[PDB]
Amino acid sequence: SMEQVAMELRLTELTRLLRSVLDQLQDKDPARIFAQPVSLKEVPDYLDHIKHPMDFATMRKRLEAQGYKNLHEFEEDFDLIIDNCMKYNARDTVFYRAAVRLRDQGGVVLRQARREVDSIG
Ligand code: NA
């Protein structure tokens, strides 16, 4: 049907906006601390601590599979990256600190993306 295509055209444009959002968020992690999943070979106990791991490459594969229905789902994944890090790592570490900064710097970008999504559809 013609409805399904118009929907697919919107999902596609939502994917195009979320791609740009993802690039802007990832630019706020120049150290690439959140680039890739936490290594289970290197932190073998990680899953005893963190039940839902997340990272920017894993978000990217979901993004390109058009697996984000809306901005809320996308934000959930971003928040996981931050919240996981802040639990596993103590306050006085470079990792915890990198998350706090990513959160603060990401808020501006997510603020405007919420307006652009409401505004465009
Ligand atoms: Na902790």
UniProtKB/Swiss-Prot annotation:
Tissue specificity as recorded in UniProt: Highly expressed in testis.
Species annotation: Homo sapiens
Bromo domain boundaries: 9-113
Coiled-coil features, chain-numbered ranges: none
Subunit structure: Component of some HBO1 complex composed of KAT7/HBO1, MEAF6, ING4 and BRD1/BRPF2. Component of the MOZ/MORF complex composed at least of ING5, KAT6A, KAT6B, MEAF6 and one of BRPF1, BRD1/BRPF2 and BRPF3. Interacts (via PHD-type zinc finger domain) with unmodified histone H3. Interacts (via PWWP domain) with dimethylated and trimethylated 'Lys-79' on histone H3.
Summary of the function given for this chain in its UniProt record: Scaffold subunit of various histone acetyltransferase (HAT) complexes, such as the MOZ/MORF and HBO1 complexes, that acts as a regulator of hematopoiesis. Plays a key role in HBO1 complex by directing KAT7/HBO1 specificity towards histone H3 'Lys-14' acetylation (H3K14ac), thereby promoting erythroid differentiation.
Cross-link (Glycyl lysine isopeptide (Lys-Gly) (interchain with G-Cter in SUMO2)): K41
Protein's UniProt name: Bromodomain-containing protein 1
Section covered of the full-length record: 555 to 674 of 1058
Species lineage: Eukaryota, Metazoa, Chordata, Craniata, Vertebrata
Subcellular location: Nucleus; Chromosome
